[PDB]
Design a protein around this ligand. Structure first.
Ligand SMILES: [Zn+2]
Length: 67
């Protein structure tokens, strides 16, 4: 939980030499999650797209579910 420190980057080169501040402890950063990274949920059935997953997900229920 929580947001990573801003004004920086995940991949690249750091300005820390022999001496400096201790950077965050990282094991393995997972990829492929709901972080709204310029992703829009669009409905292929009727072209219904919304800024929310619930909106689209709920919408699709009408298109398909128990038919
Ligand atoms: Zn739709």
């Amino acid at each position: 939980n929580g947001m990573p420190l801003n004004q920086g980057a995940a991949l690249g080169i750091a300005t820390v030499d022999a001496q400096g501040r201790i950077q965050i402890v990282n094991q393995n950063k997972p990829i492929a999650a709901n972080t709204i990274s310029n992703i829009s949920f669009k409905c292929d059935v009727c072209s219904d797209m919304f800024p929310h997953l619930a909106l689209l997900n709920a919408h699709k229920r009408m298109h398909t579910d128990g038919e």
